[model samples]
Target: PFIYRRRVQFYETDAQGIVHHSNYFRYFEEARGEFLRSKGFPYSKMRDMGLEVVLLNAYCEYKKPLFYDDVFEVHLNLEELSRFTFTFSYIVFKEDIAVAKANTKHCMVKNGKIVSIPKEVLEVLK
Candidate 1:
């Protein structure tokens, strides 16, 4: 599992800076991004390998609302790994209370065509 910390930003205001619901997706992506980076494949390196993970679908279940300036943590776990796709599950916590849960599915793309994940990438994922 990978954990990323975040705080509500004023710029994300919709409910007067209550942390817009849509921003939850961004937090999920943020955790995913950091996960890959930690695994030695940042976006730059992935692109250099002629590979990129494209979002296929995502679902978030908002349990509790996060308030402005409230520090939170997003925990990520790779729940599914397949030849052509992978999925990550996320849980958001504020003071040990779960605020949201989400899952994002993605597929590797090279030259606009879905492809198998690279051996190196798969090794790290495993």
Candidate 2:
């Protein structure tokens, strides 16, 4: 599991003073990047290998409102991995309370064509 900590900022809230729905995706994206880096493959490293990970889909389910200044953690897990694609699941929590659940689907691409994920990346992920 990869955990990324974030503190809600004033600008992240809406007029209602709660976190905007759209921001969850941003949090998930940050967590995903950190997750990859933790596995020894940052986006720069992937690019250097002549590979690119493109997001195919993103989803988020909000269970509770996160107010301004709330400290939360996003947990990321590699749910699935295949020759051409991979999926990551995430859960946002404030202390022990679950605030949201999300996932992102991605595919490997090279030279604008879909391709298999590199063995080194897969090995680090596993």
Candidate 3:
């Protein structure tokens, strides 16, 4: 698992000072990017390897609101790792309360056709 941190900005908040609902996806995307970086294989490198991971689904459940300036951590973990597809789960937390939870399903594409994950990258995740 990897932890991605973000600071809630004023622009991310609503009139009540709570983070806007739509901002969660942005946070999740950011976490995904950091996750790839942590693996030492960022999106650019993945593309260069002839493997492109595309998100097929995204889901999020909000349990609470985060105020501006609040620091949050997005914990990322893999659920199912497959050749052509994988499931990623994210937990957004402030202290012990889970502000939100999300998951994304992704698959690899090569030459415009779905393909299995490259052996090297799969091994790294394993």
Candidate 4:
């Protein structure tokens, strides 16, 4: 698992000061990018190796409102990986409370069609 922290920007919130709900997934994505990079699997390198990954699904549950200037940590983990798909899990923590939790499903693609997860990448993930 990997953890990253980010502060809610004023622009991320509405005039009411509550963060726009949509940004929670974006925050998870940012943490996922960092995780991949830490494992030497940066997105550019994956594409250069002919492996394309696309988001297949995602789900998030928001427990509390995050306000502008509020800092939170995003936890990213590799929950599962298979021949054609992998699942990334996330938990957003604001202080001691779990403000949000989510996951994104990804599948490999080639020639505009779904493809098997490359063994090389799988080995790295393992």
TM-score to native of every candidate shown: 0.93, 0.93, 0.90, 0.91
Q: Candidate 3 regions off by >4 Å?
A: none
Per-candidate alpha-carbon RMSD to the true structure: 1.3, 1.2, 1.5, 1.4
lDDT of every model, 2 decimals: 0.86, 0.90, 0.87, 0.87
Model 4 C-alpha lDDT per residue in residues 22-105, reported as the tens digit of each score: 888889888877777888878779888777889999999989889989999998888999889999889989999889889999
- Extract clashing residue pairs from model 1: none
Ranking by TM-score: 1, 2, 4, 3
In terms of lDDT, model 4 sits at: 0.87
In the range 1-126, model 1's lDDT, one tens digit per residue, is: 899999888777574646788899988878877887888877678888788879899999989888878899999999999989889999999988999999999888999888888887898776
The alpha-carbon root-mean-square deviation between model 1 and the true structure, to one decimal in Å, is 1.3
What tens digits encode model 3's per-residue C-alpha lDDT throughout 1-126?
A: 789999999999888779988889899889888887778878788888787888999999999899989999999898889768888899999988899989989988889999888787786565
lDDT of 1 at 60: 93
> Candidates 1 and 4: which is better by TM-score?
1
Q: What is the C-alpha lDDT profile of model 2 across 1-126, one tens digit per residue?
A: 889999999999999989999999988888877877887778888898788889999999989999999999999998999888889999999999999999999998889899888788788767
